[PDB]
Amino acid sequence: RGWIFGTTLDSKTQSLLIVNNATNVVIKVCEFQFCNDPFLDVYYHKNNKSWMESEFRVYSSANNCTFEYVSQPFLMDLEGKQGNFKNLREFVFKNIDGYFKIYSKHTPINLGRDLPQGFSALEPLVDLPIGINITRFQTLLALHRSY
Amino acid sequence: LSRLDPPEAEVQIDRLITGRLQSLQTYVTQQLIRAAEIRASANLAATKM
Amino acid sequence: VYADSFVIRGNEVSQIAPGQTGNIADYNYKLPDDFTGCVIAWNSNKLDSKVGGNYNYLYRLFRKSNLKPFERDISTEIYQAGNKPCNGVAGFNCYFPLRSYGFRPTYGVGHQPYRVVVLSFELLHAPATVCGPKKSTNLVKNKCVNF
Amino acid sequence: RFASVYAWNRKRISNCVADYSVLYNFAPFFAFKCYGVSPTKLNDLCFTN
Numbered sequence: 001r002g003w004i005f006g007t008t009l010d011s012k013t014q015s016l017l018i019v020n021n022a023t024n025v026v027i028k029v030c031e032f033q034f035c036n037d038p039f040l041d042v043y044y045h046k047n048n049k050s051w052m053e054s055e056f057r058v059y060s061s062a063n064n065c066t067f068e069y070v071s072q073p074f075l076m077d078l079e080g081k082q083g084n085f086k087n088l089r090e091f092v093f094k095n096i097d098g099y100f101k102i103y104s105k106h107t108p109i110n111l112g113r114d115l116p117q118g119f120s121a122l123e124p125l126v127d128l129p130i131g132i133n134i135t136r137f138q139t140l141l142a143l144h145r146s147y
Numbered sequence: 148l149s150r151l152d153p154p155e156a157e158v159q160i161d162r163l164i165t166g167r168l169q170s171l172q173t174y175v176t177q178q179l180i181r182a183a184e185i186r187a188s189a190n191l192a193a194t195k196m
Numbered sequence: 197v198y199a200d201s202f203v204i205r206g207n208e209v210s211q212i213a214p215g216q217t218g219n220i221a222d223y224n225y226k227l228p229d230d231f232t233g234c235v236i237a238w239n240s241n242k243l244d245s246k247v248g249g250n251y252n253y254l255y256r257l258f259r260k261s262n263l264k265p266f267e268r269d270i271s272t273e274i275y276q277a278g279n280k281p282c283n284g285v286a287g288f289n290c291y292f293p294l295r296s297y298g299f300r301p302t303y304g305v306g307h308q309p310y311r312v313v314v315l316s317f318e319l320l321h322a323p324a325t326v327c328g329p330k331k332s333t334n335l336v337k338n339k340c341v342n343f
Numbered sequence: 344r345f346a347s348v349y350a351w352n353r354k355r356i357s358n359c360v361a362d363y364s365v366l367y368n369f370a371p372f373f374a375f376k377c378y379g380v381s382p383t384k385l386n387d388l389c390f391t392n
C-alpha cells in the first residue's frame with residue numbers, strides 16, 4: 001500500500017501520503033502530525049480466512065494542507081495463472097528543482113529467479129510539481145493479513 | 148569567477164575558450180603540413196637507401 | 197503555467213533573478229539558473245502600509261543552510277547561535293528566525309512594500325494545454341506547405 | 344552635510360573589516376548600480392584601500 005515521504009515525518013514538517021487501492025490513488029502533501037502504525041488484527045493469519053480490508057486512518061491530522069491529485073491507480077495487477085508466473089513491479093522516484101517524477105512498468109516472467117536477468121526499460125507515468133525537500137523514505141505495508 | 152556573477156561569467160569566459168580553440172587549431176594545422184613534408188623526405192631517403 | 201506571488205520590500209526586488217544570492221534568495225525563495233518564464237513587479241504602497249506600520253508581513257532570517265531552488269520552508273524553531281543548546285523560547289544566542297517588516301508611508305522609495313508575482317512556463321515535447329488566440333485551419337498532405 | 348558637486352570631498356577608508364551587505368539599511372536607495380564587479384560578491388574579494 002503506497003509510500004510515504006518526508007524530512008521528519010512529524011507535525012513540524014510537510015510530508016507526502018501516496019496511497020493506492022484497487023481503483024484509485026490519492027496523492028496529497030500535508031503537514032501530517034502523526035503516523036502511528038497500520039492497523040493490525042493481531043491475528044496475523046490467513047490460512048483459514050481470506051477476508052482482510054478497511055484499515056484506513058494511517059495519519060492523525062492535517063491542519064494546513066493542499067495539493068490534492070486523486071487520479072487513476074498506479075499499478076494494475078495482471079492475473080497470475082498456472083503458478084510460476086508473476087509480474088515484477090518496477091519503480092523509481094527522483095526529486096530535482098521541486099519536481100517529482102515516478103517511472104514504472106510491469107515486467108512479466110518471474111518463474112525461478114528472484115531478480116531476473118535480461119533487459120527492460122521503464123516508461124514515464126506522472127510528474128508532480130509540488131516541490132519541497134524529501135530526505136526520508138518509508139513504506140505502508142499492511143500487515144493485517146500476510147503469508 | 149570570483150569577481151563576477153554566473154550570468155555574466157558565462158558570457159565572459161566564452162571569448163577565452165574561442166581564442167584558445169583557435170590557437171590550438173592553428174598548431175595542429177601547421178603540424179599536419181610539417182608531418183607531410185617529413186614523410187616525403189623519409190620516402191626519398193628510403194628510395195635512396 | 198505556474199503563478200506564485202508574494203510581497204517583498206522594494207530594496208530586494210533585484211534579488212529575484214537567476215543566480216542572485218542574499219538574504220531573500222538563499223533562505224526564502226530561490227530561482228534556478230536555467231529559469232524560463234519571467235517576473236512582474238509593481239509598487240503597492242497604496243494598500244500595504246499603515247501610519248503606525250504594517251506588521252503582518254514576515255520573512256525568514258536564519259537557516260542552517262541555503263535551500264534548493266523552488267523549495268518551501270514554513271517550519272518554526274529556535275536557531276542555535278551558540279555552544280549552549282537552545283531548548284526553546286528566546287534566550288541568549290538563541291534567536292527566533294522570523295522577523296517582521298515595518299512598512300510605513302513615510303519611508304521613501306526602496307523601503308515601501310513591493311508586490312511581485314512571477315510566472316513560470318515550460319517548453320517540452322508534451323501535449324500542449326494552454327496558448328494564445330490562433331485559429332486552426334485544414335490539413336494539407338503531399339504538398340509543399342508552411343506548417 | 345554633503346559637499347557641493349564642484350568641490351566634492353574625498354574620504355579614505357582602510358585598515359578595517361568591510362561588510363557591503365549592510366549598506367541597504369543606511370540609505371533608502373534602490374539601484375546600487377556597480378560597474379567593475381557584481382554587487383553580490385562585494386564581501387568576498389580583498390582590496391588594498
Ligand SMILES: *[C@@H]1O[C@H](CO)[C@@H](O[C@@H]2O[C@H](CO)[C@@H](O)[C@H](O)[C@H]2NC(C)=O)[C@H](O)[C@H]1NC(C)=O
Nearest residue numbers: 295298303304307364365366367368369370371
Ligand atoms: C546610521 O543611520 C541608520 C538609520 O537609522 C542607523 O541604522 C540603525 O542601526 C541600529 C544599530 O545601532 C539598528 O538597530 C537599527 O535597526 C538601524 N535602523 C535603520 C533604519 O537602519 C545606524 O545605526 C546609523 N549609524 C550611525 C553610526 O549613526
Ligand SMILES: *[C@@H]1O[C@H](CO)[C@@H](O)[C@H](O)[C@H]1NC(C)=O
Nearest residue numbers: 020021022023024025026070
Ligand atoms: C479506492 O479508493 C477510492 C477513494 O474514495 C474509492 O472511491 C474506491 O471505491 C476504492 N476502491 C474500491 C474497489 O472500493
Ligand SMILES: *[C@@H]1O[C@H](CO)[C@@H](O)[C@H](O)[C@H]1NC(C)=O
Nearest residue numbers: 011031062063064065270272
Ligand atoms: C496552518 O495551521 C497550523 C495549525 O494551526 C499552523 O501551525 C500553521 O502555521 C498554519 N499555516 C499557515 C498559517 O500558513
